[PDB]
Amino acid sequence: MEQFNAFKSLLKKHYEKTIGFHDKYIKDINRFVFKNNVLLILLENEFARNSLNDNSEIIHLAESLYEGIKSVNFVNEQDFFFNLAKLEENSRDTLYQNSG
Numbered sequence: 001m002e003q004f005n006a007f008k009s010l011l012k013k014h015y016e017k018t019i020g021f022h023d024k025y026i027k028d029i030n031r032f033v034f035k036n037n038v039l040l041i042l043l044e045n046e047f048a049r050n051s052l053n054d055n056s057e058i059i060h061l062a063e064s065l066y067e068g069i070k071s072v073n074f075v076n077e078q079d080f081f082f083n084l085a086k087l088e089e090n091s092r093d094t095l096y097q098n099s100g
Helices: 002-014 019-024 046-054 077-085
Strands: 032-034 038-042 071-075
């Protein structure tokens, strides 16, 4: 819900000047997930990924929306896929209700 808007908008303040970069790759993706103290985000561009991982620390800000992020990383559509593929046969086996 507001989460993405919270963590993401947080970046804005950070990259409130690195426009060109945005208009470059980060543009407007749509593949990112959280569910292991870690966060993964789509990023095939070799360069964009080079620099980003060379010195980014997306935790330096994302450590406000959550208790305390552990880290952040970006990869390619294929690699990223391997991250969610890890899950075996089981998955959302949890069964709750908005009225416990």
